[PDB]
Amino acid sequence: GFRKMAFPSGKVEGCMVQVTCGTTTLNGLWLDDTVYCPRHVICTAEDMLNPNYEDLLIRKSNHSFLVQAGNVQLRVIGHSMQNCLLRLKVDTSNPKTPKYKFVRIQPGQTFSVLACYNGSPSGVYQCAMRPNHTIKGSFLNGSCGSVGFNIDYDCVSFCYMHHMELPTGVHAGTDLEGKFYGPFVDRQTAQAAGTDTTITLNVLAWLYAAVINGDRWFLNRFTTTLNDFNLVAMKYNYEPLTQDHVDILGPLSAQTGIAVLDMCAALKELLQNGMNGRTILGSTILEDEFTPFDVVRQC
Amino acid sequence: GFRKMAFPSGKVEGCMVQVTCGTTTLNGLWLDDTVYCPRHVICTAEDMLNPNYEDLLIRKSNHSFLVQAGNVQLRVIGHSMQNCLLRLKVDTSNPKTPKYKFVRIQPGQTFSVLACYNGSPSGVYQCAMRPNHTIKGSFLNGSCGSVGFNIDYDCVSFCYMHHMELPTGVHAGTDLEGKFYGPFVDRQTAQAAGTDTTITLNVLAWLYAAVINGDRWFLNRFTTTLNDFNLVAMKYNYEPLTQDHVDILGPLSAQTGIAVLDMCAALKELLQNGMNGRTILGSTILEDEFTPFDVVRQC
Numbered sequence A, B: 001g002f003r004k005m006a007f008p009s010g011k012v013e014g015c016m017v018q019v020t021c022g023t024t025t026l027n028g029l030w031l032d033d034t035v036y037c038p039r040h041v042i043c044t045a046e047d048m049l050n051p052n053y054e055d056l057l058i059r060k061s062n063h064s065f066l067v068q069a070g071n072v073q074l075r076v077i078g079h080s081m082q083n084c085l086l087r088l089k090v091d092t093s094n095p096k097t098p099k100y101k102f103v104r105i106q107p108g109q110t111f112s113v114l115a116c117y118n119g120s121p122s123g124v125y126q127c128a129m130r131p132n133h134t135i136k137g138s139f140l141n142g143s144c145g146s147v148g149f150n151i152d153y154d155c156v157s158f159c160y161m162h163h164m165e166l167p168t169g170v171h172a173g174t175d176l177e178g179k180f181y182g183p184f185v186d187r188q189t190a191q192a193a194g195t196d197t198t199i200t201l202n203v204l205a206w207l208y209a210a211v212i213n214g215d216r217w218f219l220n221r222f223t224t225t226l227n228d229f230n231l232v233a234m235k236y237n238y239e240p241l242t243q244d245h246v247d248i249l250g251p252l253s254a255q256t257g258i259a260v261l262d263m264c265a266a267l268k269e270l271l272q273n274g275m276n277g278r279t280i281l282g283s284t285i286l287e288d289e290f291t292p293f294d295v296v297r298q299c
Ligand SMILES: COc1cccc2[nH]c(C(=O)N[C@@H](CC(C)C)C(=O)N[C@@H](C[C@@H]3CCNC3=O)C(=O)COP(=O)(O)O)cc12
Pocket: A024, A025, A026, A040, A048, A139, A140, A141, A142, A143, A144, A145, A162, A163, A164, A165, A166, A167, A171, A186, A187, A188, A189
């Protein structure tokens, strides 16, 4: 019964709008009297090679932006730029605005994406911020402005806004203060992601889940120090494990009676010898987007 | 990128309530002026072993039901049993009632589940009705009354309400008329489902999904007959393929350009020789919980 789950999306659906600037349309996020969207909405295809966004913006007026919340048209009172985001002040304050916060997600953590097209929600799914600051998403044309989030209690933490697809098929975007994750820039360019690495904390959580499921062929009685495990991990493009990660795994360690460093010695052997066709939780590939929190929450 | 995706759950979240009867609480679905929930809310531990629900319900009155829609308590005006569901009439009609229908879904079809606890939505995910009429869901204690659904245009098709977990960890429940899917009954007894099989139609749709987005490595130049493929299907516990199924795969066959019986030959090879450590859509197993409809909508 281990599956990826998304947070319920209703609180975010109530904030999704459409923003149109001439020929280009995309999604924006309506909280109180401000609408947030990618700033490349003001761009033409010609402007996309090397845009001067401050120039492009001064040449726009409030009336240049068509903002539609479903049926209603909203009147843009003012506009400003915040990093790679446009902030549109609007006539009307969103009655559906939830309690919210803007957070910067860290590599390895997960969030739900509400994929939207023309301001209309289309689907929800879970994904993770990769170590190389991309996300392996599902985005078609028209998805820019779609938002990633977590929900704790009744408060929505917005963490991601979609901007771009890279030639490798992965996706890039910003936090809700308009700062890109990673070295990417909002212009058509030859940019490519760094070498991705595997989220070791999450592979270890997945192995604990596999043991909880009654799968423990990979266990052994070797010992490893944290330092010696980290040296092998990096050879195989796995992220090194920090002290904090070891403590994050404490609850799963106690539930299974497998010491964290002993699970690390199990993983070290999988890296060095491969699986030899055997499966773990049905797969020959080590899953790395299930967090320790996901495992404990589903037991 | 190709992921399992759930419908946005906003329209369903507005319908979720909490129903308590003595010391037992679960989720209910509030549409217009009636609340639907599993009838075993009226049960105790001793009753759950072999209950007579007609007897237990004649002994209750409207006062015996506390229905909470967030902060507000709704007053129960009437009550009746419909198969394995209770129907509670309440004085207030739900203003957030969407356009909706009750549908009984067929084996092989998919839907989203809004997993709820104490009337509070907790997560959303996609799953399928298995050929043996169970679902492989993620349901913890307190999730009874959680609902499965699809959305088309603005209309919510409710198809599932959650009732129980089988010893194997799969889940069983009813349609919104209260009739169980499968051979199960709502008593605290150990119950077996029939032997499951793989949903062939869905594996084929997913192979088309792989061709549309990305890899064709598993394709070959051969062909098979419907009858000769089904001979391979039975040996591997796959559902036999019919002509109607082939008619369904028409549009996917046209967009990709691979005839349906050619894709069957590719599948027969994958079953006979395994995947030799290769991956098809980031997966090392043949995924069978995407319908043809799901693939087209996501492309
Ligand atoms: C030379 O240029 C390229 C070369 C090779 C690969 C490339 N990839 C991207 C990109 O990733 N994204 C943006 C614009 C870039 C130029 C800033 C886009 O082009 N379309 C989508 C998002 C995309 C669409 C499919 N999946 C997505 O994530 C929007 O949502 C907003 O753009 P639209 O208003 O719909 O045109 C540009 C690019």
